[PDB]
Design a binder for these strands. Structure first.
Ligand SMILES: Nc1ncnc2c1ncn2[C@@H]1O[C@H](COP(=O)(O)OP(=O)(O)OP(O)(O)=S)[C@@H](O)[C@H]1O
Ligand SMILES: Nc1ncnc2c1ncn2[C@@H]1O[C@H](COP(=O)(O)OP(=O)(O)OP(O)(O)=S)[C@@H](O)[C@H]1O
Ligand SMILES: Nc1ncnc2c1ncn2[C@@H]1O[C@H](COP(=O)(O)OP(=O)(O)OP(O)(O)=S)[C@@H](O)[C@H]1O
Ligand SMILES: Nc1nc2c(ncn2[C@@H]2O[C@H](COP(=O)(O)OP(=O)(O)O)[C@@H](O)[C@H]2O)c(=O)[nH]1
Ligand SMILES: [Mg+2]
Ligand SMILES: [Mg+2]
Ligand SMILES: [Mg+2]
Lengths: 318, 330, 343, 235, 258, 354
DNA sequence: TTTCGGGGGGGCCGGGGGG
DNA sequence: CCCCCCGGCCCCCCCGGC
């Protein structure tokens, strides 16, 4: 078959600010800005798949209307964004003459701005300062720390928070109603649990489950979406007896095809984020895990090394 | 390249259709259903070496486009340049343009994407998003930690498990039929055991075994042939060595280890692996015995990985096992 | 000035014995039949797979691959059908992507009529990556699809001492061949043949002692035999070479010195052990040889209980591992002797 | 400086303080300047009054544990910057080099926080090694040793045969010094560098200063008023 | 040096043919048969296909005992070709099951001989027969005019939109600094037939193409003074340049309408 | 003039004094040098390894080996940095110390040594047999300081071009030499001279230089202070003669190097005071020692063996000290910044003593 | 400080085209 | 025959975890 079905992430991508779930206060602020205009330079930061690009595009559309094509300059990591681009194309766009209503400005949308080089960011400073009367800049990024301090000083900070399970369930229910998808409460709970606050991941998993099995229930959802291995690693590290930890390692991780490097890196991360355990114990476990990680990187990526790491961790915990 | 009979068995038996991929029934069924109704999403294939990921994606492309699939797909791997410039120009142009031959959608196969740079992966995000109406991406990986979370967020994940024994048996039967070979049940069991779920190992060992037989037509591949060609210890040798270590005194254990190793020139690392596998099933009253065994044997394995004195390493193995098992009394 | 070039046979006649007696064909490889038979069968099967030779030093891996290429192609067609890269050449990721790929994609060189009539001439070329364990992980990863895509005209040979240094995908792609250690049981015939060819006279068991001292390395044994032959020829007495002369040439500690060390350890006094070791290090004995001899003496002694041997085995393993990292021999030896004396 | 001050603060390592400033926060603090954080920690981990000592543990024991961890971290760093470029080990290097040793001696800074002194010492060592190499290859044709052997064995005798004559015979020993210099292809810069190498009770700065200026002027004049041989002929 | 032997009276012809598409593709498989030489290649992006055909009449002498496939790299072939002069005859020579191809430049008047050898490459790109397609529009125009239009409009934008409607051909570009539009109409002159603009329309068409691909395509204007463009809504655009005994064809896929 | 250690260095095999068995073995090797394998001379520092190598070369080729010249070779890295290597060469042999360029020593092996290896011998260097020499000799000093990559590069170079060159590697210890290189070489142990041989050499030097000695015992004492290092013994004799107006008395003291005195003072301080402030002062002393080209391994060895000679320590303290020394010597081998490991060792010793 | 590899930005050099 | 435009090397500088 040479035909494609449009992904539901694109088909049901919000087109207005009112269709975005989560971060209610920021969405209301953006709605007020759209109503009144005078949009300032802004930096929107947050975790993947929470509606940052969607928010920026919706704000630009509501602000500009018919003028969107002329008054919006969009650049992302897939386009050329070197110092020359900033110095020529962005400057030309900023200096461009464009008659707009008495409360609107041209918009430059720099998506994934955290990937831009230091030189381009430095060149953007006086460009933003001088042409603010007619042009405004909207950065979208995952890590606001990558944006240099002078640019942060020039922009309004908007830190997006993770989506609660309630909002994900609400959006999934809207999509299900619009698509007439047969489902069960347990299946939706499994999808939400596996998504971990990633709306895009949740929608993709729902669409894949519907396509592959039809009915959205726990069995089909877990068949399509594998249980995250970090939870398995956490269970392995928290086991009371060495035999149980070895059992988990051999059955749920090693026999499923997970590589030793992945297992050791996930163990390091989980141990780092193990608040239930005393910090000094966590540091000793990290020392052992690092020894094992160095051994694996050298080339000895065997099940015996991971078993020895588990044995040392249990000896420390005892 | 005069004929397909000149190719190594690992490549001469490469599946050409989705019906020739074994041990991945769930993934094959799901992808076949996706393609049948035109609901193919962006795909990720994560799995260990030699499980059938490249074979599966190539078979899927051939099924979608037919024999002339190479000209209608953009395949990139670790042997080709995949920098940020490549993503910006070549991948973008392929994704944004129509097919030359047909009017169908376009497929981009990023094999071994775990070797891609972070900048290229980041550049791929909006490329995947913008052109999803007419283009689809497939990613293949052995190590998931090398893939950025943004890329993983946009793909549907399929895990290729280590090949089950039944699938290996069926493929071995097909290969035996094609090659006009004979294999004993014990030889098949040993081959499956040493495969560790990798089909390439099975095929290479079978080719070596065929090369070993004086008369490949009349002769049959026995476990002895497999052990000789692979130069691996027999289960009886491992059992004898372990029994001597556990029961006999130091002199007798040293003599037995040396004699067993010198009988066929076995490697110490293979003996250590076999003994570890045997001891895994042992029921130990004290967990400290298991702790000592694992730690000391892992240390010895790491030391062997860098060379060193072989006799001292063997004595270390003997002493480590004896000391660890001394903790089962009190 | 200038010197007339020497003939191949004349030049080889005055080479070191290790190079002089390098195998010229697959039939001259001594104790690697389990793999040599498989390689030989490819002369007729003509379906040679990708090969990963791995083994300890001086076991016959490079010799085996060179002999196989010679037998497959012949003296005239070898050069056009072989691309060899080793640790003395740059092998970065860019090199793998460009040069190796370009050679792998080339059409095979046209065989001559004589070559076709005299040699099997398989329809593919060979890329040898000797000392492949020195290549980085990324460069190795760059070879994965090159190996499979162009397997119809190219085959790869990777040779190494440490198989763990090869990434798992490459090891999976290649057919593995382990080269066994060469000892007195499986390598005596070749050494005896070399000694007879060079007319070396030695006492009974001298060759066995040489092979035992070599500890799996036939190159070392041949070099030791050449040294002993040179000594005997210089002496001019005509007497047979003895095991004592071989041991002295090999740097083996005399038994009396080992017994003195054992007695000092038994005494247990730190000052005496330190003084004796300080005097001992002046002789220049290799620490590895001393550790090996001590291990042999202690493990095979019936006057020590199981616990003592259990502890001493781990002590010797730790000392050997530390020495393998290039540590100060004096400090490590003194520490080992003190720790043994405290058992 | 702020990173060193915060990482060595004992409050963040307490039961209550660890839940607010978590281990992830400390790793991020290291990643703020990974290049300089381990150096600052190694520089300032011996200048604190700890408040995290375990019952029965002295300050010296915790210092020794921190030093051991710092050595392990140095090994890890050497691994990172090798031909394999194992940058994925950077987080582990954060724990071994900064977080663990700091947690072992966390407390109140007993004095002013000092910038790392390792870089200046490294530059000085590189300069002195370059000078030693120059001297060694100037005297290679005469001596039989490596540069290390030249520094450890030859230099004291060269001092005895180069500096002592000035202090003992006054200005009448200039000829002997010049003869020795010529025999080993040594120049005036080589003489000064050699005199600059000695440590302990053999320091020559005060001794060189105490020499009468007339003797030094005469030595320079005599050296400049004659031809000398050249060891390495550059072309 | 007997299996395949082809002769070009002037080496400039083969050099110009190679330069016509050397910037589009890198690896090309030339298939030589008794009826002449053909070649088909696809660029790395898989957006442009180049198809070259040269008949026997283009050669002073041509002999090919059996069909032979030769895989070549374009930059190496061009580097070898540029060595020869414009007054020297060229000869392509290949043996049975060759591993290389020989290029011989001859100058009888000066008795000058120049031999070059190029190693062949194994390319698993089977010749894909391009089934003939009916096109909505077929327009033939001078090569210079098309090249000028492409060079002018490519400066403004990276995409060029071609519209064919009743007795009118429009080339449009829209970019950051402005837009450009060129309108041409059919016109025939008997005094200067070489400058005529010929248009045959069945259905109107409107297709967008990448500017870089058009810039590469126009490099074949040297081979022929006129260019024929065939456009259909359901087929890729076909740009053809006619040689004395052959042709060079560029099949360019249009951009997705979205 | 030239120091007595250099002035009286033997220049031939027949001129060697100590280790007659080694001299006979070297003569046997030089009897038929056409098929001489690669040589690896290992032994304690300052025993005469370089002297014996030069004597062997003289026996093989002739006195011309001692006519040495120095040239400079330029190398470029992947980063475009320019490095200079000082090459000591003679008409028959070439000497190199690749470790001079640190991690770039591999370059020397890949370009310089390979270039020399691919060049055949064409100059008519008539030998004792009657024909001309066919190979050149390459000496690698401080071969044990080479990086593993450089040794790997040497691996196949020594085999492919053995017909063109022969390698002689001199080392104070074989522990850092990788197994393949050792397999590729003929190992030669060079024992240190005995006390009597050192005394005889010193007496010959004294007679040649006309030095007044109250009794021969003084020389014996010098030998005892040398610990088998002949170069150190000769230099100490010259220093003592200069200090005592070319007249040695039974009461003349033994002169130690400045760094030895500093290390002994550091050992005394460590034994006396065990505190964090004392550790800071020890760090300052270590920095001073390192800044003046005192290798870290030498510092560690000297400090360990000075601590082990303290009469106030018991057996447990000495055992702990030697164990810590072994551990931190391994750490130094695998480490980059030596000061970290030295400070860790000192802290562990201080904890063990207290 | 810095042992590969990737990315970016700036400087010349030189082929080709135009007048 | 000479001048100008513009593609391609060449070099040098800077991250490298989440
Ligand atoms: N708050 C949201 N409400 C509704 N849909 C959402 C929301 N967030 C994400 N989605 C859905 O997921 C798709 C992708 O959302 P995006 O705005 O691209 O997330 P993102 O944070 O910009 O992703 P990154 O940071 O570039 S990885 C949208 O088209 C929506 O279909
Ligand atoms: N499921 C399978 N069924 C049949 N043959 C298989 C299967 N998997 C692997 N093989 C065989 O092993 C060879 C390699 O299979 P691949 O598809 O390349 O495995 P892979 O997972 O892509 O390896 P990596 O991840 O690149 S190391 C095939 O040509 C087959 O001959
Ligand atoms: N199996 C063997 N049969 C005969 N001679 C051997 C054999 N192995 C080693 N030798 C001898 O030792 C010399 C070196 O053999 P090699 O083939 O170079 O061993 P190697 O395994 O390749 O060494 P490495 O791994 O590079 S240290 C040969 O020239 C032979 O003279
Ligand atoms: N008289 C005499 N002096 C020797 C002999 N061997 C070495 N020496 C002296 O000892 C010095 C040091 O020898 P050297 O080879 O440089 O030491 P090594 O290379 O570190 O082993 C030399 O300068 C000689 O003067 C010998 O056999 N006889
Ligand atoms: Mg986004
Ligand atoms: Mg694959
Ligand atoms: Mg080899």
């Amino acid at each position: 078959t040479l035909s494609l079905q449009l992904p539901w992430v694109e088909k049901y991508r919000p087109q207005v600010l009112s269709d975005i779930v989560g971060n209610k206060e920021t969405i209301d602020r953006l709605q007020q800005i759209a109503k009144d205009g005078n949009m300032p330079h802004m930096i929107i930061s947050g975790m993947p798949g929470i509606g940052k690009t969607t928010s920026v595009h919706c704000l630009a559309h509501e602000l500009l209307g018919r003028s969107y094509a002329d008054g919006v300059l969009e650049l992302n990591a897939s386009d050329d964004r070197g110092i020359d681009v900033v110095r020529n194309q962005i400057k030309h766009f900023a200096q461009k003459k464009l008659h707009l209503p008495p409360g609107k400005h041209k918009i430059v949308i720099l998506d994934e701005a955290d990937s831009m080089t230091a030189g381009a960011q430095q060149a953007l400073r006086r460009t933003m300062e001088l042409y603010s009367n007619s042009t405004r800049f909207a950065f979208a990024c995952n890590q606001s720390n990558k944006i240099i301090e002078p640019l942060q000083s020039r922009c309004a900070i908007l830190r997006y928070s993770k989506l609660s399970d309630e909002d994900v369930l609400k959006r999934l229910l809207q999509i299900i109603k619009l698509e007439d998808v047969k489902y069960t409460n347990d299946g939706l709970e499994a999808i939400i649990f596996t998504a971990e606050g990633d709306m895009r991941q949740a929608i993709n998993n729902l669409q894949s489950t519907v396509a592959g099995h039809g009915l959205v229930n726990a069995d089909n959802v877990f068949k399509i979406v594998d249980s995250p291995h970090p939870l398995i690693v956490k269970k392995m590290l928290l086991a009371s007896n060495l035999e149980d930890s070895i059992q988990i390692l051999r059955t749920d991780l090693w026999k499923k095809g997970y590589s030793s490097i992945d297992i050791v890196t996930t163990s390091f991360r989980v141990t780092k984020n193990l608040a239930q355990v005393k910090e000094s114990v966590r540091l000793e476990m990290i020392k052992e895990i690092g020894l094992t990680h160095m051994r694996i990187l050298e080339g000895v990526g065997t099940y015996l090394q991971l078993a020895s790491m588990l044995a040392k961790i249990h000896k420390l915990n005892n | 390249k005069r004929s397909k009979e000149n190719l190594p068995w690992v490549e001469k038996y490469r599946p050409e259709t989705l019906d020739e991929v074994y041990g991945q029934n769930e993934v094959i069924t799901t992808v076949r259903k996706f393609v049948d109704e035109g609901k193919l999403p962006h795909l990720l294939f994560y799995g260990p070496p030699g499980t059938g990921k490249t074979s599966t994606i190539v078979a899927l492309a051939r099924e979608i486009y037919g024999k002339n699939y190479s000209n209608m797909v953009l395949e990139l791997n670790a042997s080709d340049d995949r920098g940020i410039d490549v993503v910006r120009n070549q991948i973008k142009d392929f994704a944004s343009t129509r097919q030359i031959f047909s009017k169908g959608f376009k497929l981009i196969i990023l094999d071994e994407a775990d070797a891609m740079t972070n900048a290229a992966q980041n550049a791929l995000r909006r490329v995947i998003e913008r052109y999803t109406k007419n283009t689809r991406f497939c990613v293949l990986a052995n190590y998931a930690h090398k893939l950025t979370p943004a890329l993983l967020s946009r793909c549907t994940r399929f895990r290729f498990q280590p090949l089950p024994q039944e699938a290996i048996e069926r493929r071995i039967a097909n290969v035996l039929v094609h090659e006009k070979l004979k294999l004993s049940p014990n030889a098949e069991k040993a081959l499956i055991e040493l495969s560790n779920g990798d089909m390439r190992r099975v095929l290479n060992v079978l080719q070596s075994c065929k090369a070993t037989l004086d008369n490949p037509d009349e002769d049959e591949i026995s476990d002895d042939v497999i052990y000789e060609c692979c130069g691996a210890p027999r289960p009886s040798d491992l059992k004898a060595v372990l029994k001597s270590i556990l029961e006999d005194d130091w002199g007798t254990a040293h003599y037995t280890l040396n004699k067993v190793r010198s009988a066929k020139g076995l490697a110490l690392i293979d003996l250590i692996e076999g003994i570890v596998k045997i001891l895994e099933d042992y029921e130990l009253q004290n967990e400290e015995t298991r702790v000592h065994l694992l730690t000391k044997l892992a240390d010895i394995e790491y030391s062997i990985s860098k060379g060193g004195n072989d006799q001292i390493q063997g004595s270390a193995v003997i002493g480590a096992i004896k000391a660890s098992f001394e903790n089962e009394t009190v | 000035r200038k010197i007339s070039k020497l003939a191949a046979e004349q030049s080889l006649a005055q080479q070191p014995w290790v190079e002089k007696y390098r195998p010229k064909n697959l039939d001259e490889v001594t104790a690697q039949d389990h793999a040599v038979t498989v390689l030989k069968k490819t002369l007729k099967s003509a379906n040679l797979p990708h090969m990963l030779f791995y083994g300890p030093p001086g076991t016959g891996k490079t010799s085996t691959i060179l002999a196989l290429t010679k037998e497959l192609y012949g003296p005239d067609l070898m050069k056009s059908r072989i691309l060899e890269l080793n640790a003395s050449d740059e092998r970065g990721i860019s090199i793998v992507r460009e040069k190796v790929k370009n050679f792998a994609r080339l059409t095979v060189s046209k065989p001559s009529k004589h070559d076709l009539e005299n040699y099997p001439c398989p329809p593919y070329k060979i890329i040898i990556l000797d000392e492949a364990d020195s290549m980085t992980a990324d460069a190795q990863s760059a070879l994965r699809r090159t190996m499979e895509t162009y397997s119809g005209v190219t085959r790869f040979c990777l040779i190494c001492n440490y198989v763990t240094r090869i990434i798992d995908p490459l090891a999976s792609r290649c057919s593995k061949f382990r080269f066994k250690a060469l000892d007195a049981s499986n390598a005596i015939d070749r050494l005896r043949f070399i000694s007879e060819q060079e007319n070396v006279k030695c006492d009974d068991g001298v060759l066995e002692r040489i092979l035992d001292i070599s500890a799996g390395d036939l190159r070392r044994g041949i070099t030791l035999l050449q040294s002993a032959s040179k000594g005997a020829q210089y002496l001019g007495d005509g007497k047979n070479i003895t095991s004592t002369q071989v041991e002295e040439l090999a740097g083996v500690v005399p038994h009396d010195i080992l017994i003195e060390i054992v007695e000092k350890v038994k005494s247990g006094d730190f000052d005496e052990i330190k003084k004796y070791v300080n005097t001992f290090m002046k002789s220049g004995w290799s620490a590895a040889s001393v550790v090996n001899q001590l291990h042999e003496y202690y493990i095979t002694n019936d006057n020590f209980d199981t616990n003592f041997k259990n502890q001493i085995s781990w002590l010797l393993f730790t000392t050997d591992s530390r020495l393998n990292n290039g540590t100060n021999e004096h400090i490590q030896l003194l520490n080992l002797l003190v720790k043994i004396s405290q058992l | 400086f702020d990173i060193a001050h915060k990482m060595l603060d004992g409050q963040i390592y307490s039961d209550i303080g660890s839940r607010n400033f978590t281990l992830n926060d400390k790793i991020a603090l290291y990643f703020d300047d990974f290049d300089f954080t381990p150096l600052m920690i190694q520089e300032n981990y011996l200048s604190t009054r700890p408040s995290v000592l375990k019952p029965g543990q002295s300050h010296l024991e915790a210092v020794a544990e921190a030093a051991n961890c710092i050595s392990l971290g140095d090994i890890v760093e050497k691994k990172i910057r090798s031909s394999e470029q194992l940058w994925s080990l950077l987080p582990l290097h954060a724990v071994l080099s900064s977080v663990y040793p700091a947690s072992k001696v966390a407390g109140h800074m007993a004095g002013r926080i000092n910038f790392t002194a390792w870089l200046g010492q490294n530059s000085k060592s590189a300069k002195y090694y370059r000078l030693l190499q120059e001297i060694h290859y100037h005297t290679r044709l005469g001596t039989s040793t490596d540069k290390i052997g030249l520094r450890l064995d030859y230099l004291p005798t060269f001092r005895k045969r180069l500096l002592d004559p000035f202090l003992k015979q006054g200005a009448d020993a200039i000829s002997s010094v010049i003869e020795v210099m010529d025999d080993y292809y040594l120049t005036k810069e080589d003489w000064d560098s050699i005199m600059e190498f000695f440590v302990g009770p053999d320091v020559t700065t005060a001794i060189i200063k105490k020499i009468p200026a007339t003797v030094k002027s005469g030595f320079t004049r005599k050296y400049n008023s004659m031809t000398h041989p050249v060891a390495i002929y550059r072309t | 040096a007997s299996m395949l032997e082809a002769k070009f009276e002037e080496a400039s012809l083969f050099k110009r043919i190679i330069d016509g598409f050397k910037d589009c593709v890198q690896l090309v498989n030339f298939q030589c048969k008794e009826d002449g030489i053909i070649a088909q290649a696809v660029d790395d992006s898989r957006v442009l296909l180049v198809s070259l055909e040269i008949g026997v009449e283009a050669f002073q002498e041509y002999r090919c005992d059996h069909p032979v496939t030769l895989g070549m790299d374009l930059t190496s072939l061009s580097k070898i070709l540029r060595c020869g002069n414009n007054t020297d005859t060229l000869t392509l020579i290949a043996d049975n099951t060759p591993d290389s191809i020989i290029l011989l430049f001859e100058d009888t008047k000066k008795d000058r001989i120049a031999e070059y050898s190029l190693k062949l490459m194994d390319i698993d790109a089977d010749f894909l027969k391009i089934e003939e397609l009916q096109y909505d529009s077929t327009l033939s125009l001078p090569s210079s005019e098309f090249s000028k239009i492409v060079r002018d409009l490519s400066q403004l934008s990276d995409s060029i939109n071609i519209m064919i409607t009743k007795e009118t051909i429009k080339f449009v570009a829209d970019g950051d600094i402005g837009s450009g539009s060129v309108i041409i109409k059919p016109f025939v002159d008997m005094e200067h037939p070489e400058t005529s603009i010929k248009l045959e329309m069945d259905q109107p068409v409107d297709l967008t193409f990448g500017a870089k691909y058009l810039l590469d395509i126009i490099k074949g204007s040297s081979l022929s003074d006129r260019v024929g463009i065939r456009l259909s809504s359901e087929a890729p655009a076909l740009f053809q340049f006619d040689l004395k005994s052959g042709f060079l064809q560029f099949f360019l896929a249009p951009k997705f309408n979205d | 003039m030239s120091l007595w250690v250099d002035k009286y260095r033997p220049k031939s095999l027949n001129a060697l004094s100590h280790n007659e068995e080694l001299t006979n073995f070297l003569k046997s090797l030089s009897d038929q040098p056409r098929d001489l394998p690669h040589l690896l001379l290992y032994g304690p520092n300052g025993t005469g390894k370089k002297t014996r190598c030069m004597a062997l070369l003289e026996s093989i080729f002739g006195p011309g080996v001692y006519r040495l010249k120095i040239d400079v070779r330029q190398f470029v890295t992947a980063s475009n940095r320019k490095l200079e290597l000082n090459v000591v060469s003679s008409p028959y042999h070439l000497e190199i110390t690749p470790s001079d360029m640190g991690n770039n020593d591999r370059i020397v092996i890949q370009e310089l040594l390979k270039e020399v290896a691919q060049m055949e011998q064409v100059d008519f260097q008539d030998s004792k047999d009657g024909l001309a020499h066919r190979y050149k000799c390459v000496i690698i000093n401080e071969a044990n300081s080479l990086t593993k990559d450089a040794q790997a590069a040497l691996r196949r170079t020594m085999e492919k071009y053995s017909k063109n060159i022969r390698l002689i590697m001199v080392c104070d210890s074989m522990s850092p030499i990788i197994a393949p290189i050792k397999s590729r070489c003929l190992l030669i142990r060079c024992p240190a001279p005995s006390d009597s041989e050192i005394s005889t050499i010193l007496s010959d030097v004294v007679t040649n230089e006309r030095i007044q000695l109250e009794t021969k015992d003084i020389l014996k004492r010098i030998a005892q202070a040398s610990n088998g290092n002949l170069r150190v013994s000769l230099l100490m004799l010259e220093s003592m003669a200069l200090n005592n107006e070319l007249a040695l008395k039974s009461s003349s003291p033994i002169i130690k190097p400045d760094w030895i005195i500093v290390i002994h003072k550091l050992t005394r301080k460590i034994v006396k005071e065990r505190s964090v402030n004392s550790l800071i002062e020890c760090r300052a002393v270590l920095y001073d020692l390192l800044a003046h080209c005192i290798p870290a391994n030498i510092i560690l060895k000297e400090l360990t063996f000075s601590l082990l000679d303290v009469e106030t320590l018991n057996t447990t303290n000495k055992s702990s000290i030697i164990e810590y020394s072994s551990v931190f010597d391994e750490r130094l081998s695998l480490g980059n910044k030596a000061i970290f490991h030295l400070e860790g060792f000192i802290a562990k010793v201080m904890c063990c003593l207290d």
